Amino acid sequence: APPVKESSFVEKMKKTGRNIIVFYGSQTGTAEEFANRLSKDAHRYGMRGMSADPEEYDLADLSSLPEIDKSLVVFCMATYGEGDPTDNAQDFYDWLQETDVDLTGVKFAVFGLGNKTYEHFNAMGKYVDQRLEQLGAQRIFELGLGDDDGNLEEDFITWREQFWPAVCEFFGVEASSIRQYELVVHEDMDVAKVYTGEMGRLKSYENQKPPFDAKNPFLAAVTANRKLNQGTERHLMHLELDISDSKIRYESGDHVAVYPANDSALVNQIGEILGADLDVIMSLNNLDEESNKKHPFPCPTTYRTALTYYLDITNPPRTNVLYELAQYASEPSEQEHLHKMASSSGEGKELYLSWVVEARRHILAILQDYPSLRPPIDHLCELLPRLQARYYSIASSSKVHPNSVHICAVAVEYEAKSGRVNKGVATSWLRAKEPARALVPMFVRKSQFRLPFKSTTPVIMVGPGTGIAPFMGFIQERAWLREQGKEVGETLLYYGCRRSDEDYLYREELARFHKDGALTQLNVAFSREQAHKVYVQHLLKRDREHLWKLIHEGGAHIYVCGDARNMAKDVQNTFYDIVAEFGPMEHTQAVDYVKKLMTKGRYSLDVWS
Numbered sequence: 082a083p084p085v086k087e088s089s090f091v092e093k094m095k096k097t098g099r100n101i102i103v104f105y106g107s108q109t110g111t112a113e114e115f116a117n118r119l120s121k122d123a124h125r126y127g128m129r130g131m132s133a134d135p136e137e138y139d140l141a142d143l144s145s146l147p148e149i150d151k152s153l154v155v156f157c158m159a160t161y162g163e164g165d166p167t168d169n170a171q172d173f174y175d176w177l178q179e180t181d182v183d184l185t186g187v188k189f190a191v192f193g194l195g196n197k198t199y200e201h202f203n204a205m206g207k208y209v210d211q212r213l214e215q216l217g218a219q220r221i222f223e224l225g226l227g228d229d230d231g232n233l234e235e236d237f238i239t240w241r242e243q244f245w246p247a248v249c250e251f252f253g254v255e256a257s258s259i260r261q262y263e264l265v266v267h268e269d270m271d272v273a274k275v276y277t278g279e280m281g282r283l284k285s286y287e288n289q290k291p292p293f294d295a296k297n298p299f300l301a302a303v304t305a306n307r308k309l310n311q312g313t314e315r316h317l318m319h320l321e322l323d324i325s326d327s328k329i330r331y332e333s334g335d336h337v338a339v340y341p342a343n344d345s346a347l348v349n350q351i352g353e354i355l356g357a358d359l360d361v362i363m364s365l366n367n368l369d370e371e372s373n374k375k376h377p378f379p380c381p382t383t384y385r386t387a388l389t390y391y392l393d394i395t396n397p398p399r400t401n402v403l404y405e406l407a408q409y410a411s412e413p414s415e416q417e418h419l420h421k422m423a424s425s426s427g428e429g430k431e432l433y434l435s436w437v438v439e440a441r442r443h444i445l446a447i448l449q450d451y452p453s454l455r456p457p458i459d460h461l462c463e464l465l466p467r468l469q470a471r472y473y474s475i476a477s478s479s480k481v482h483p484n485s486v487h488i489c490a491v492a493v494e495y496e497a498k499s500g501r502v503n504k505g506v507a508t509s510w511l512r513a514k515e516p517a518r519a520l521v522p523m524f525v526r527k528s529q530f531r532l533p534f535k536s537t538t539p540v541i542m543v544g545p546g547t548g549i550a551p552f553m554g555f556i557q558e559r560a561w562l563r564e565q566g567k568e569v570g571e572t573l574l575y576y577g578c579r580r581s582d583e584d585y586l587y588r589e590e591l592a593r594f595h596k597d598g599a600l601t602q603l604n605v606a607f608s609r610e611q612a613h614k615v616y617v618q619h620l621l622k623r624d625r626e627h628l629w630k631l632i633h634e635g636g637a638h639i640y641v642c643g644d645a646r647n648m649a650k651d652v653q654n655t656f657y658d659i660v661a662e663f664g665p666m667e668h669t670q671a672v673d674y675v676k677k678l679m680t681k682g683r684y685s686l687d688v689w690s
């Protein structure tokens with residue numbers, strides 16, 4: 082960055098006969114997928130659309146959109162940490178805040194993607210919807226607020242079903258399977274031109290050249306991969322990735338992303354059940370010669386490679402995918418069930434929610450349970466979403482391990498109501514990496530989760546379970562700072578696990594840090610060692626007096642890592658209670674006080690799932 086912007090999107094629409102453009106603010110591909118669905122929808126209403134990444138354009142050109150008759154712009158925007166825009170929407174967000182351009186004549190609609198388990202729920206979607214109106218544009222349809230904590234796919238379905246009629250009524254317009262790509266099989270292909278799993282340029286995995294990032298991941302050697310937990314209820318692991326000579330920089334608190342490979346057995350079974358040759362070399366070429374998206378993923382390549390490295394074959398298929406696949410089910414009842422999965426209500430929706438989503442049925446499961454469903458492999462590859470990278474909180478300090486990035490994760494393996502055992506893609510793949518050479522394509526994503534600039538500032542870390550991850554780096558660093566002869570303030574860890582002899586992660590290492598004084602306190606809540614639950618917040622409440630002292634008089638920084646659904650909220654509530662008792666102040670003021678700590682960078686979060 083800064084990336085070189087494409088030419089005016091309005092002129093592109095004029096040259097290609099498009100009247101609707103749908104921008105996506107996305108990081109995990111959800112909003113991008115929703116934008117593509119809306120763009121494709123345009124055709125069924127006598128219109129023509131295109132989806133677009135805002136980062137590739139100058140949104141100031143919106144002021145020219147009215148030059149196209151019956152034009153409209155839709156924004157599908159997801160929100161990230163602290164109500165910020167997705168990385169690809171930062172330029173647009175800053176422009177909205179700074180600009181004063183008049184958007185009179187512009188017609189817009191916004192669908193926001195968020196999750197109610199966060200403070201700033203759909204902050205981006207809300208901001209864009211508000212700002213465009215302030216700039217003079219006119220809203221054509223109500224803001225959509227999708228919540229990933231319930232069911233986002235359904236929120237989109239409901240919104241979309243009302244959106245189009247509204248557009249048709251306003252513009253006075255009125256309302257067959259179509260493919261975006263064409264299959265080209267390559268019979269005499271030179272092996273040197275066939276992709277084999279790389280993400281960017283051909284052979285970029287074999288021939289590595291910095292700088293390394295999301296488009297050019299560095300293949301890091303797995304130098305260590307060991308089981309962290311004592312018991313066998315689950316599998317928790319510690320991996321060390323060698324980033325020597327990658328020139329990659331990182332700090333404790335940052336995240337490492339990895340591009341995994343799907344289970345080979347699963348890939349094989351999909352090809353097997355479809356009666357397809359997975360080793361066929363081919364390309365899926367966009368039927369729209371004007372679009373910059375030439376292929377759905379790196380091509381040419383084999384179906385096996387696409388299914389292994391480029392496509393998501395484990396998450397429940399979205400309704401549009403099942404809708405398009407229905408045409409390939411020869412049993413009427415099965416074609417009907419698949420068709421109705423896109424319903425906004427009734428039994429069709431109920432079935433999608435229970436049989437597909439709740440049961441966690443992936444594509445192969447559906448092909449097995451609806452045996453008449455036998456789609457051509459090429460169309461299936463065009464429908465499946467892209468395989469996303471997985472993020473992990475770096476468990477090492479670059480002050481201590483500048484050439485190694487550590488990872489602490491729990492392997493995902495569970496019983497699904499679908500009747501099968503589902504395996505986590507990234508963790509199963511990581512678990513199988515054996516030192517001596519096992520390579521892991523990765524890159525680092527800078528975060529704002531960081532130790533205080535001043536070594537003297539107190540630190541309160543709360544990270545039960547895998548939430549301990551970033552704190553191992555924090556502690557290594559604070560330990561290093563002391564060893565370097567600096568004045569280090571109190572460093573407190575509030576950790577938690579089920580039992581000391583089951584899953585007390587880094588037990589030995591933490592004991593050492595404690596003994597040496599790197600950890601002023603090592604408070605551990607063993608949730609299952611007694612009849613009642615003992616959690617980290619119970620220990621925080623226990624130490625309320627001292628914590629208030631560190632917070633209100635010591636300028637302590639609070640860090641919470643791990644489970645975002647329940648733990649983070651329970652911990653936040655405990656801090657509210659501590660402030661309310663020691664301020665003293667009413668609950669309402671204690672809440673503002675704590676939320677202020679967040680805005681002032683003294684209460685940071687690294688929570689997920």
Ligand SMILES: Cc1cc2nc3c(=O)[nH]c(=O)nc-3n(C[C@H](O)[C@H](O)[C@H](O)COP(=O)(O)OP(=O)(O)OC[C@H]3O[C@@H](n4cnc5c(N)ncnc54)[C@H](O)[C@@H]3O)c2cc1C
Nearest residue numbers: 471472473474489490491493495505506507508547550689
């Ligand atoms: C910023 C950030 C930091 C993270 N840090 C870490 C970290 O340091 N350590 C770590 O372990 N993880 C961390 N993660 C989570 C990590 O990115 C992956 O989501 C996790 O490792 C699982 O990935 P996977 O590919 O193995 O599983 P996937 O194949 O992606 O499957 C994950 C999905 O399985 C489903 N699922 C899991 N259990 C069940 C169940 N029992 N019943 C029904 N559905 C279930 C859920 O839909 C879950 O989303 C972090 C995530 C984020 C966003």
Ligand SMILES: Cc1cc2nc3c(=O)[nH]c(=O)nc-3n(C[C@H](O)[C@H](O)[C@H](O)COP(=O)(O)O)c2cc1C
Nearest residue numbers: 107108109110111112159160161162195196202203
């Ligand atoms: C690290 C992380 C931080 C998030 N922060 C927020 C947030 O502050 N507010 C919100 O409403 N949703 C938040 N979400 C939820 C996403 O907005 C939601 O899952 C969205 O569907 C993701 O879309 P994408 O796949 O197109 O990026 C967060 C998700 C992750 C993984």
Ligand SMILES: Nc1ncnc2c1ncn2[C@@H]1O[C@H](CO)[C@@H](O)[C@H]1OP(=O)(O)O
Nearest residue numbers: 545546577578579608616617647648651
């Ligand atoms: N709501 C919550 N608040 C704090 N810790 C929680 C929690 N829910 C579960 N935990 C605990 O976090 C640790 C890592 O998962 C476990 O000890 C788990 O205990 P439990 O599983 O026995 O409930």
